[PDB]
Symmetry: D2
Subunit: 354 residues, 4 copies
C-alpha cells in the first residue's frame, strides 16, 4: 500500500438511543440515507426494518445522541454543504427533514458532544483546513457560524472528549503523519495549535478513552499493520511512543472498551475476514488476532448493547448489512455467526479525499 | 455508637443537568423542597438563587436525570406516599407539580436509572420490606404497580448499576449487617434472593463502580471507622473481605471516582470537619485522611462538574448550604474554602427509621 | 486482648540453603537448638531427621543465608549474650560450634543481609534500646562492636531491605505503636531517627517487599484482627493509612509473595486453625480468609521451595513440628494436609519481653 | 538489513559479585580475557584496573555467579571446545586456570543458574543443534556429559528462569524466527519440544522476568526496530502478540527491571548513540526513546549496582570500555556522561555464526 492510502471504512454509523437500543445509518443504491433499529434493548431483539430518509446525500452519514436523548444525523448534500436531521422526541420514529447547515464540505462529517451538552461537527473544508460548527445551546437547533481551525487534512477527522471535558481532534496531515489539535479549556472556543504525533498512517485515526482517563489512538500504519499510541497522563501533555502489532489489516480499525475496562480492536484482516484483538490485562499486552468466519467487504462498525454485549456490523458480499454479537455480557462470552439485516443493499458513500 | 445507629446523612441531593450544570435539592424550614443551580457549567459560575417547589414533604428528596435529560425528584408526602415532579424540558426551569405515585413509604426514596432508560425507585415499605416501582417506558410518565422485594430493612436502600446493566440494591438488615439483592438479567423484573455481606454497619451503604466494572461499597462500621468491600469480578459472584480504614468518622461517607479512574471518599471526621481519603494508585492503598478547615453539620454530598472538578456540599453551623471545589481538573488540584449558597436555611428531613 | 499483648510466635526459623533446600531450626525440651532439612529440593523430598547443636539457648534462634550460601544461626545464650554458628561450606552438614558475639540481649535476635553481602543483627538491649552488630566484610567472621540505635522497644525487631538497598527496622514502641528507623544510605552506618507509624499493634511486625519496590507491614491490631500499611513510593517518604481486615487472629501473621507477584498472609485464626488470605489482584482487595483443617499451637512459619511452592510449618497439639504445602507451583494449586516431621518435640523459647 | 543479520553485540559480560560489586569481562587485542571490577559497592567506587587471564580464547566470555557467590566464566578455546575458570573464594581475586569442558562449540556460550543452585551452559554445537552441560551438584566442579536438545540455531541462545524455576531457552531458528524450548519440571532433565514464536528477528533474543512472573522477550526485527512479546501467564502456555516500537536500532537491545518494577530497554540507535526507553506505568506503554550524548561502537551491557542504580558499559571509538550510570537510586535519577575504564582496548570476539 502507498503511504497516502486510506483504508476501507465502515459501511454504517451506529448509535445508542436514549433507551440504549442500537440504530444504524447507511446509504443505499438510491444515494439516500436509510436506517434500522432494534425494537427493544434485548439480546433477542428483532429489528424494525429499513426506513428511508428522503434526500440524495454525498457522504457517509454521521450520527450522535444529543444530551436530551434525541439522535441527530449529519451528512454532505448534493450541494456539497452540510445537512442534518433529528428525532423530534427521544426513542421515537418522528424525524425532521434534512435541514441546512451550509458550508463547503470536502470530507465525511465527524460529530462530538461537548461536556456541556452541545453537539459540535468537524469537517475538512474547501481549503483543506479543519472547520467546525456547533450548537450554541445544548440540544437546541441554534448553531454557530462556521469557523476555521487551520491545518491541511488528508484524512477524515476523528474527535473525542478528554476525561477533563476538552474535545481533541485527530487527522492525517499533508505529510501523511497523524496530527492533533484540542480545546485548551473544556467546551470553550479556545484551541491549541496543530501538533504532530509523527509516524505515517494509512487509515483514518480511531480514538478511545481508557479507564484512567488517557486517550489512546489506533490507526493502520505504512506497513499495513495496526499501530497505537496513548497519552502519558498525570497532567503531562506527552504521548507514548508508537507501537505496532503484528498482523496485516485491510480496513480501518474499530476500537471499543469492554465492561471489564479493557480495550479491544476489530479490523478486517489479511484474509478479508473479521479479526479481533484484546488487551490481556490492565494496559497489558495484546492478544494474537482471532478470526471470525466469513469474508467481509467493509471495515467493522462496533457498538455495545444496553447490557454491555459487543455487536459488530459489516458489509457482506451480497452488499447487505450483516452483524454478529456476544451472546452474554461476560468478557469470555461466545459469539454468534454473521446474520443478515436484510431489505436493502448499501454503498460506500464516503467522500473520496484525493 | 450503637450497632443500630445510622450516621448523619447529607443535607441535599445533587444532580447534573443535561448540560452538566449542578443542581441541588433540600428541604427548608417550611418543610418544602427548594432547589438552586449553577447558571453555567463553568468554574466561576454564579448560582441562580433558591427557588421553592410548593408542597409540604416528609423525607429527604431524591433526584435523578432521566434518559432524555430531564431531572425528576422523588419525595415522601404528608400522606406518607411517594410523590414526584420533573422538568418538562431538559435544562429548563419549567417543572410539574408534585404528582402521586401512592404507596406507603417508611424510608427516604432511592432512585436509579435502568440500562434501558427507565427510572426505578426503591423504598422501605409499611411492612419494612424493600418495595420498588418503575417507569414502564423510558423517560415517560407511565409507572408500574408497587411490587415487593421482601427482606427487613433498617437503613435506607442504595441502588447502583453493575457494569452489565443489572441494578443491585444494598441495605442494612435486621441483624445490622449489610445485605444486597440484584436483577439477574439487565433491566428485567427478575431478581435474586437477599444475601448477606455480613459485618455491622452504622450508616447507609454507599456504592460506586470501579473502572474495571467491579462494584465497591463503603459504610461506617461498628467501631465508627470507614469500611469497604468490593466485587471480585471475572464473572465471579464473590466479594472481597471487608477492610476498615483508620480514622473515626461522624457522618455517612460519600464516594466519587475521579477523572483519573481512582476512588476518593469524603466524610465528616472525628473533629467535625470534612475529611478526604483517596486511593494512591490503581486499586491501591488509601491515603491518610486529609482535613478541610471548617466545622460542618451534615455529611458531605459530592458531585463532579462538566470538566471533572470535584465539588462538595454541606450544612453549615448557620444552617445554610456551603460548598467548596477543586479549582482545576487535575487530580492534584488545589481546593477552595467553604463558600455560602445563601438565601434559605435547611433542615434534615430524612425519615427517622426507628 | 490487652494493647501490650504479643501474639503467639512461630515455633521454628526457616531458611533456603544455597541449593534452595528448606532447613528449619527450633528448640527442643533440652533447651538446645535442633535442625532438620529437605534432602533434595523436590516436591517429594524426604527430610534428613532432627540433628542437635550442642549448647543450651535462651531465645528463639534466627537463621539467615550468607552471601556465599552458608547458613548462619543466631541465638541468645545462657549468659544472655548473643551466640552464632554457621555452615563451614554451603549445602554441607559441617557446622561451627556456637561462637560468642557478646552483648546483653533482651529480645529474640533478628538478622538481615545488607545489599553489600554483610549480615547484620538487631536486638533489644539491656536498656531496652535497639542495638545492632554486623559483619565488617561480606560473609566473613569479622564483626563490628555493638552500637546503639536508641528507642524503647516492646516487641522483637523486624528488619527488611528496601528496594534501594537500605535496611529498615520495625518494632513496637513504649506507646504500643509501630515505630521504624532506617539506613539513609544503602549498607552504610548512617541511620534516621525513630518515627512512628501510629496505631496499636499486638504482635511483632512482619514486613515484606512488593514487586513495585514498596515495603508493606502486617501486624495484629488492638481489636485482634490483621492490619497492614505500605510505603507510598515514588521517592516519597510517606506511608498509606492503616487498613484492617475482618477476622480475629490468634497468632503473629506470616506474609509471603507468591510467584505471581501477589501477597498472601497466613495466621492462626479465631478457631485455632490455620487461616490464609491473598490479594485477589495487583495491589488488590484481599480475599476472605480460608481455613486449613487442624488445630495448631503456634503461628505459622512460611517459606517457598525452589519451584515457588509455598510451604507452612507449625507446632502441633503433640508438640511436634507439622507442615503442609502446595502440590504444584500454580497460584491455584491444591494443598496437602498437615504431615508430621517427627523425632523431637519443640518448646517456644522466645524471650519473654515484659 | 537482511532477515539473517545478527545485530552488533555487547563488548563485555558483567556480573555482580557476592558482595554485589560489578565485575566486567572482555577480550583484548591479545585474544585473552581480561577483567576489571569495582573495589567497593559504592556510587563513587574506583575500579581495580585491568587484569589478564592467561589463555587465548575464541568467543565472547560468559560469566555467572554460582549459588555460593563465586564467579565463573565460560569461553570457547583455541580448540573450539568449552573452557571455564572460577573464583576459588567469593569476592576474592584468586582464580582457577582455564579448565576443559570439551565439546565442539559453534556459538558464544550462554550460562544460567538452575533453581537448585546448579549452573547450566547452552551452546550451538557442531551440528548446529542446541547442546547443554550442567553442574551435577550445586556450585561444584562436577559436570555432566554433553547432551543435545536438537533444533537448528542461527543465533546465540538466551536462557532464563521462569518464576516457577524452569529454565527456558530462546534462539533464532533456520527460518529466522524466534524459537524456544523449556524444562517442563523445574531444574530437571525433562524438556519440551521446540516451538516457534514466529516473526523474524535480526539480533540475539534478550529475555527478562516481569514482577508478575511472566517472561518478556526483546529482539530487533526485520525492519530494524525493537520488538517484544510476553507470556500471557495464569498457568497459560500462551504468549502475547508481537509489538514493535518505533525507532531504528543498530545493536542488540539490553533489558533491565528497575527497582520500581518497571522494564527499561537500552540499545544503540540509528544515530549510533545510546538510546533508552522505559515502561511509563505498570505493564504500560513505552516512552519515546531518549538519547545519551556520545557515539558508541557496541551494543550496551546493562547492570544494576548494590543500591539499584543502573549502569551501562559500551565500546568507545577509541576501542576502550566506557560506562555511565544513574547518580541516585530514584527512577528519575540523573545520569552521568560516559567515563573511560582505561588500560586496555577490546575486540569483539563473538563467534561468527554464518
Ligand atoms: C495538519 C497539519 O497542519 C500543518 O502543520 C501542516 O504543515 C502539516 O503538514 C499538517 O497538515
Ligand atoms: C434483608 C434481610 O432479609 C432477611 O434475610 C432477614 O432475615 C435479614 O435479617 C435481613 O433483614
Ligand atoms: C521506639 C520509640 O522511641 C522513642 O521515640 C519513644 O518515645 C517511643 O515511645 C518509642 O518507644
Ligand atoms: C530451532 C527450530 O528447530 C526445528 O524445528 C526447525 O525446523 C526450525 O526451523 C528451527 O530451526
Ligand atoms: C441531503 C439534502 O437532501 C435534499 O433533498 C437536497 O435538496 C439537498 O441538496 C441535500 O442533498
Ligand atoms: C466548511 C467551510 O464552509 C465555508 O463556507 C467555506 O468558506 C470554508 O472554506 C469551509 O469550506
Ligand atoms: C458475512 C457473510 O458471510 C458469507 O460468507 C457471505 O456469503 C455473505 O455475503 C456475507 O458476507
Ligand atoms: C408533596 C405533596 O405536596 C402536596 O401539596 C400534598 O398535598 C401532598 O400530600 C404531598 O405532601
Ligand atoms: C410501598 C408499598 O405501598 C403499598 O401500598 C403497601 O401495601 C406496601 O406494604 C408498601 O408499603
Ligand atoms: C462551613 C462554614 O465554616 C464556618 O466555620 C462556620 O462558621 C460556618 O457556619 C460554616 O459551617
Ligand atoms: C549457646 C551457647 O552454648 C554454650 O554451651 C554455652 O556455654 C553458652 O553460654 C551459650 O549458651
Ligand atoms: C546488646 C548491647 O550489649 C552491650 O554490652 C550493652 O552495654 C548494651 O546495653 C546492649 O545490651
Ligand atoms: C496439625 C495436626 O492436626 C491434628 O489434628 C492434631 O492432632 C495434631 O497434633 C497436629 O496439631
Ligand atoms: C582458553 C584455553 O586457554 C589455553 O591456554 C588453551 O591451551 C586452550 O586451548 C584454551 O584456548
Ligand atoms: C557441543 C557438543 O560437543 C560434542 O562433542 C559434539 O559431538 C556435539 O555435536 C556438540 O558439538
Ligand atoms: C563514549 C565516548 O564518546 C566520545 O565521543 C568518543 O570520542 C569516545 O571514543 C567514546 O566513544
Amino acid at each position: 500500500i502507498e503511504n497516502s492510502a486510506i483504508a476501507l471504512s465502515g459501511i454504517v454509523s451506529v448509535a445508542n438511543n436514549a433507551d440504549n437500543r442500537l440504530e444504524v445509518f447507511g446509504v443505499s443504491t438510491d444515494s439516500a440515507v436509510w436506517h434500522n433499529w432494534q425494537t427493544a434493548p434485548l439480546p433477542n431483539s428483532s429489528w424494525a426494518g429499513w426506513n428511508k430518509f428522503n434526500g440524495v446525500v454525498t457522504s457517509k452519514p454521521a450520527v450522535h445522541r444529543n444530551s436530551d436523548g434525541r439522535l441527530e444525523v449529519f451528512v454532505r448534500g448534493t450541494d456539497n454543504a452540510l445537512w442534518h436531521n433529528w428525532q423530534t422526541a427521544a426513542d421515537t420514529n418522528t424525524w425532521s427533514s434534512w435541514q441546512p447547515l451550509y458550508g463547503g464540505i470536502t470530507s465525511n462529517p465527524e460529530v462530538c458532544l461537548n461536556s456541556d451538552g452541545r453537539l459540535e461537527v468537524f469537517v475538512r473544508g474547501s481549503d483543506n483546513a479543519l472547520w467546525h460548527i456547533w450548537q450554541t445551546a445544548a440540544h437546541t437547533n441554534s448553531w454557530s457560524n462556521w469557523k476555521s481551525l487551520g491545518g491541511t487534512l488528508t484524512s477524515n477527522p476523528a474527535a473525542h472528549l478528554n476525561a477533563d471535558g476538552r474535545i481533541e481532534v485527530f487527522a492525517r496531515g499533508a505529510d501523511n503523519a497523524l496530527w492533533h489539535i484540542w480545546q485548551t479549556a473544556a467546551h470553550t472556543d479556545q484551541w491549541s495549535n496543530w501538533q504532530s504525533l509523527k509516524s505515517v498512517i494509512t487509515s483514518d485515526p480511531v480514538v478511545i478513552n481508557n479507564c484512567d482517563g488517557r486517550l489512546e489512538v489506533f490507526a493502520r500504519g505504512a506497513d499495513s499493520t495496526l499501530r497505537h499510541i496513548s497519552q502519558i497522563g498525570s497532567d503531562s501533555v506527552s504521548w507514548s511512543n508508537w507501537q505496532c502489532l503484528d498482523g496485516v489489516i485491510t480496513s480501518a480499525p474499530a476500537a471499543v472498551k469492554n465492561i471489564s475496562g479493557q480495550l479491544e480492536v476489530f479490523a478486517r484482516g489479511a484474509d478479508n475476514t473479521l479479526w479481533r484483538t484484546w488487551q490481556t490485562s490492565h494496559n497489558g499486552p495484546w492478544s494474537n488476532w482471532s478470526s471470525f468466519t466469513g469474508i467481509i467487504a467493509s471495515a467493522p462498525t462496533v457498538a455495545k448493547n444496553s447490557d454491555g454485549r459487543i455487536e459488530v456490523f459489516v458489509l457482506g458480499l451480497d452488499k447487505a448489512l450483516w452483524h454478529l454479537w456476544q451472546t452474554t455480557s461476560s468478557t469470555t462470552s461466545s459469539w454468534t455467526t454473521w446474520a443478515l439485516i436484510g431489505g436493502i443493499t448499501l454503498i460506500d458513500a464516503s467522500v473520496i479525499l484525493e
